[PDB]
Design a protein around this nucleic acid. Structure first.
Ligand SMILES: [Cl-]
Ligand SMILES: [Mg+2]
Length: 540
DNA sequence: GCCACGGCGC
DNA sequence: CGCGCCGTGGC
């Protein structure tokens, strides 16, 4: 019947809002409305109307809370049916999609969004009845985490603009060097960024052997996997690979970052999304912190650009081998649990079991083999891939994988048990009961079935790691406020804080303690911590 | 501007 | 070895 009533709404109303753009830190609030009992109240002047609300309840509540924080309003996010939908099925990642699946329509009008939010919340809440683990995640993780994320996004991080100018110049000079040499080898200029023009140069003009097709166009692929095979076939190949590496880094993590510095705050406001991934891991965007290269000289150079405010320090905390520890816990493998209890270098210790030698006798290459499998086993890394990674024969790679499962037989069992669970129930679950649906486990084509199988036993591990971190963020947040410290970034199994230099050390001790004790496992949780004026220094 | 796409990073 | 990111090329 569409009851309209004057602004302001009664307490408990769901909010609907329209932004000029999707990024709340950069957007104008174009419209605000609230709904309760289906009765809609539309705000005459949105910004003024914000201070009437006591919390943001509704779709994308966190995003409205971010914009409110920018304006200096304390408007914490509360109930949001996105969070409910994501717990019901993590393929539910957007309002549009949630509405299309469960009822109603995501439109561009505030009042309609508010009414929809209220409807969907009631709907999805009923759908969750009796799902006590998922409801626990909602109350103890998702809802309170949304408030942490709002604060992190609104706070942002300071960038070293002088450093970024210098890094940009350095990389530009090396890129120019490389493309000069490519054009020399090629005999003319062409657009290096064009895979079409590159294909013609490599395979038509230079006559190099093609290998793989492109996914859809059917052309001769110029991908890294193809070039890798040809590194010796022609010196231009190596140069192109270096060019692509640097250009990706510059175009993604050097050129965009200064443009992302907000004119009002002077800081970068990375956006955090808690309903975006299949596993329950948080995601970041503008920039995506997850895709900054790891363990290359280049990745390091990017993190150096992230700095503390003057008189402050960054505190970086990292859960050491958390996914393997989780695998130990879920599988119950006594030998792997022993690896973590006899706690020296974990990969050396894994190698000593694998190869049946004392830890003293493990050489660095043996350790690398163990390290590589400790991560590959989590997603069913093939012998073929391991063979490329370690540069060993295929048969030897096979033997290494078998050694691993021979020493850790309950890991082998756990993988198979998890697949049985997925095939029986149609879903798999984390330690805390976060759930992922895995329909293709019973597929016709083996190609898709194997991808489904990897997804199936990988998610419980990644998802458990994800929720340990999120639970730690929730526990840690209010205690940081006590100290005048703040939470800035989260990526992988790492958390970055900012604190006054006088309190950095105490903040580090406190954060370490809370993270390591967030939940008891069969093995200890270990947190590496460092302090520095920049993120790279603080990783040290 | 829109899009699908190859390519690359985790 | 799903998803966010880049620039390209068609519209
Ligand atoms: Cl937008
Ligand atoms: Mg051009």
């Amino acid at each position: 019947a569409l009851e309209e009533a004057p602004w302001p709404p009664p307490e408990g109303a769901f909010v609907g809002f329209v932004l000029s753009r999707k990024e709340p830190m950069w957007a104008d609030l174009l419209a605000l409305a609230a709904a309760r009992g289906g009765r809609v109240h539309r705000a005459p002047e949105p910004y003024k109307a914000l201070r009437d609300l006591k919390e943001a309840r509704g779709l994308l509540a966190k995003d409205l809370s971010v914009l409110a924080l920018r304006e200096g309003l304390g408007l914490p996010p509360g109930d949001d049916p996105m969070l409910l939908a994501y717990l019901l099925d993590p393929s539910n990642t957007t309002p549009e999609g949630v509405a299309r699946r469960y009822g109603g329509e995501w439109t561009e009008e505030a009042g309609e969004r508010a009414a929809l939010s209220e409807r969907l919340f009631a709907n999805l809440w009923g759908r969750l009845e009796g799902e006590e683990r998922l409801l626990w995640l909602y109350r103890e993780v998702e809802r309170p985490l949304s408030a942490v994320l709002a604060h992190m996004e609104a706070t942002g991080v300071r960038l070293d603009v002088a450093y970024l100018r210098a890094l940009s110049l350095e990389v530009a000079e090396e890129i120019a060097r490389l493309e000069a040499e490519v054009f020399r080898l090629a005999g003319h200029p062409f657009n290096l960024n064009s895979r079409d023009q590159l294909e013609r140069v490599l395979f038509d003009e230079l006559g190099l052997p093609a290998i793989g097709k492109t996914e859809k166009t059917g052309k001769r692929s110029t991908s890294a996997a193809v070039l890798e095979a040809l590194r010796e076939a022609h010196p231009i190949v190596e140069k192109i690979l270096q060019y692509r590496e640097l250009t990706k880094l510059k175009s993604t993590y050097i050129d965009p970052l200064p443009d992302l510095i907000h004119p009002r705050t002077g800081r970068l406001h990375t956006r955090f999304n808690q309903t975006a991934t299949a596993t329950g891991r948080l995601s970041s965007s503008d920039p995506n912190l997850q895709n900054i290269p790891v363990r290359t000289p280049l990745g390091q150079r990017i993190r150096r650009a992230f700095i503390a405010e003057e008189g402050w320090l960054l505190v970086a905390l990292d859960y050491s081998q958390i996914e393997l520890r989780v695998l130990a816990h879920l599988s119950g493998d006594e030998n792997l649990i022993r690896v973590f209890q006899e706690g020296r270098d974990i990969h050396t210790e894994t190698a000593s079991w694998m190869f049946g030698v004392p830890r003293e006798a493990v050489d660095p290459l043996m350790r690398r083999a163990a390290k590589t499998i400790n991560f590959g086993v989590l997603y069913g890394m093939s012998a073929h891939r391991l063979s490329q990674e370690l540069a060993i024969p295929y048969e030897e790679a096979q033997a290494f994988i078998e050694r691993y499962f021979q020493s850790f037989p309950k890991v082998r069992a756990w993988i198979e048990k998890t697949l049985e669970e997925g095939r029986r129930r149609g879903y798999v679950e984390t330690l805390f009961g976060r759930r992922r649906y895995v329909p293709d486990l019973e597929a016709r084509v083996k190609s898709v079935r194997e991808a489904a199988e990897r997804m199936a036993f990988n998610m419980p591990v990644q998802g458990t790691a994800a929720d340990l971190m999120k639970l730690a963020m929730v526990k840690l947040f209010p205690r940081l406020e006590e100290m005048g410290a703040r939470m800035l970034l989260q990526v992988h199994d790492e958390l970055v804080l900012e604190a006054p230099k006088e309190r950095a050390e105490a903040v580090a001790r406190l954060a370490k303690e809370v993270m390591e004790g967030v939940y008891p496992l069969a093995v200890p949780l270990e947190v590496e911590v460092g302090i520095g004026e920049d993120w790279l220094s603080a990783k040290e």
